[model samples]
Target chain A: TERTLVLIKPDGIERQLIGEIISRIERKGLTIAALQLRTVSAELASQHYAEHEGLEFITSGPVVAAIVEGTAAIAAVRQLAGGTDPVQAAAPGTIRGDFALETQFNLVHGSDSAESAQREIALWFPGA
Target chain B: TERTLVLIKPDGIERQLIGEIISRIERKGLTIAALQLRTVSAELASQHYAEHEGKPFFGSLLEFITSGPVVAAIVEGTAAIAAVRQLAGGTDPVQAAAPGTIRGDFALETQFNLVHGSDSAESAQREIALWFPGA
Candidate 1:
């Protein structure tokens, strides 16, 4: 079975879209391998998005994390996300373009690639 | 206090995104006053979109609309107008919507934006009347 990691991010929790986001995943025919509502440390953030470590936003603040599993889970999550850069996402469509008040404060995050998904899942859900 | 009416349209229900949609609204600090699963009648559709009555897409819009049950609600809170609209993202669907938006996340058809929120207090009143008349 394909498995991928997902995160509602701090913005998602702060904005109160956790249930809504999770509901989308559930409805998409994907199964939740593991889920939780907890705050992450700066160290964890750095490790989660390690590939983007040099990026400016990594130093911003805490983010939410999860592990989602299903057929083509990685692509499914990305389709739901629309696109990474919030600004370019279609209107009335993507998370960033739709509900996000600010790009830097976008409400959710997901693993962009399989390697990242595996790595992030291991970091957040150790021994899984 | 501000109030807006929201609808998890047929596509949203069929796709099973109701919880996710509600979760976003809840996260935005809006309160749901009354909510239920319902299906609209053709007459009700005509009344709701009377302003667009003569439009070419009206009939199809009505047919697709009444095709299934929808989750209707009255959301009350501050700046609800802007908040709901923000959550809906831009209307274009192809541009301006972020991945986090209900539209961007799960919508497949323009007629099926997944969620619909009243554009204003007046809209809320009119929608409530059309969906739950004599309430």
Candidate 2:
């Protein structure tokens, strides 16, 4: 099994779909090993997003951070998210395709690779 | 302070963002008093969506929700309903909602937005009672 980190950005929280979103995760049978909520600090966001730090939109609010593990956990989450650009991507069944339209507000952000996943999970879940 | 019910639908589970989602609740300073993963039943789904029972998509909603397990949680905090609503943003998809919005990425229409947060404390309590009778 592989492990990945996902961030439910502020836009997600502002919408009150926490339950709805989590339901999708559980349905996939992926294990949510650890969870928490916190305001993303400038330094943390920068390290996490890698130059996304100065981007006010990212640092503007709090985000949900979590560790998900399963075979292909990284790819699975990235798939569920649909694609990077909202206008460019989004499928009928994808998280972005179904629920989003704007490029900036795409709700879910998944780790793209295991190395990054490890880095992200370590950054947010040091104890894990 | 208040308490509310929030549900992460099947699709959300399939995508595996449960921890990501819960983190949003925590970030809001809202307390997750309780939580669990469960597969909803038709009977419970019917009760959960009673008002829209006769609506065209009620069956669609029911089937999708029951297709797999869901994560249900009770959140408590100042102005929980409004807070959740704001956090939830708008249920109706903007179709073009700004990126990172509630409906923007997780939902585009009623069929697949991913979450089911109670709009009111009354409904919150009612749904909580219905879904978590033991609590």
Candidate 3:
């Protein structure tokens, strides 16, 4: 049983792709271990992406988080999120390519590694 | 007050249009009163389509419906019956469907229009019972 942490950043939720994104995950045979709709705090964001703290684009904003469970769920979710940059992702087949129009508002975030997933999941969903 | 029952038919589920279809409904401002995922039995199918009991398409309808589990729902709002019908376009996929409409976008064949919204309050009540007992 593999588990991955996923964040449908504010952009994706605002674009009304929550259902669309969830549908994709469900179709891929992953089970939603936990789910919730809430706004994120700046402190949480910083902690979640501490590695990118020194980078240029780090600010306070809310992002959707979920504990997704399935086999190779991390890799599976990455494939669904597509390229990080929406501009380069306009390939007519990927989620970012098909639905996103801006890079900053690229729609989703999936933990890049198991360690990140564990840390992020703990920050987002404490006591779980 | 108006209400309608919608069935995301087996084909729609199989074709993976559940989210796209739900998005359309949500965009239309309809409220989902109840929802469940279940397979339809022949008895339920026959009762649901009792209006077309003698029609040649009835058998095919039942066969297609029982093919898999469907997401059944009760949708409510103003003129929901007509609104859903409009969204569904027309009974004939060729003339009724419009681009962006559920049928227009996902329907590849007449037999698989991807959705079935109730035609009236009466139909909605009848269908709710048929698909979801005691709901």
Candidate 4:
């Protein structure tokens, strides 16, 4: 069993996709171990995307952060979230594929690897 | 299209079934017009269930509802009242409810049915006004 950090980005919240996204996760056999609705701070955002390019869009509104747990949870979450480019890379049934239109406004984020999942889980849910 | 009131009861909240419940509503083609997490007040509960004012189980219903916060929603769509009720299943989880409905799948007892939907159009209007005063 493993755990991964999942983020319903600002666009997702603004689009009222929280229930839709969470439902997909639940249906995929993953468990939402922890969840909360909170806006991102610059410091937290920087820390969260320490290696990748950060953006102001992430801090624009509240995000639904959750710790999803299950076997191969990290890989499972990424698959459900689809690819980074919604129009081109993502498949039609996945979260981004079904709801998103552009890369910048992609609806969700999931850890890419086991180590990243560990780091992100600690950063997003320090108490979990 | 029509509108109806839905409630994720205290047991639903405590058990973390909010997303699951909302998902079912959404998939059934209902729009979540409004939503919030609120703890029921005694006065509100009394008025909401005024039709059952003298019933034996009314008091227990009020107490249980006020025991914790619940997710209240105004769901809108075709035959929304009946649609939500269909999704929620029968009141008795074990005996009356069906196998695939919300109560049937996640609930176990009558006292802990986990979800509620307005039973009729008139009731939906009354309940919506009481739960979402300005809506």
Model 1 per-residue lDDT tens digits across residues A1-128: 57888878767776788887887777555789888877666787677656663434544545556788875678667767655566666234445656775567777777777988888788889988
Question: Could you arrange the candidates by lDDT from highest to lowest?
Answer: 4, 2, 1, 3
Off by over 4 Å in 3: A1-128
Tens digits of per-residue lDDT for model 4 on B16-97? 9999899877755578999999989999989887888888999898899899999999999766776677778788999988
DockQ for each candidate? 0.14, 0.03, 0.02, 0.02
Best by TM-score: 1
Q: Worst lDDT window (10 residues) for model 1 chain A?
A: A53-62
Model 1 vs. true fold: TM? 0.54
Tens-place lDDT per residue, model 4, A46-118, is 8986797534688899999999999989999998987887645665456865556567878899999999998
What's the chain B TM-score of candidate 1? 0.91
Q: Which of the two, 2 or 3, has more DockQ?
A: 2
Per candidate, the number of residue pairs that clash is: 27, 42, 0, 0
TM-score of each: 0.54, 0.50, 0.50, 0.52
lDDT of 2 by residue, B47-128 (tens): 8888897789788778888999999999999998787766665654433333344544444344666677898767987998
lDDT of 3 at B127: 76
lDDT of 3 by residue, B1-135 (tens): 477788899888998888887766665556787788888888888888889888889898889888899998877765567656656655555566754457766676678788888876777778777776666
TM-score of 3: 0.50
lDDT of 1 by residue, B1-135 (tens): 887788888988998878888899999899988799988888877887788888898888788779999898888799987798888766634244454566655543365577888887788888877776654
**True lDDT of residue A99, candidate 2:** 73
lDDT of 1 at A67: 84
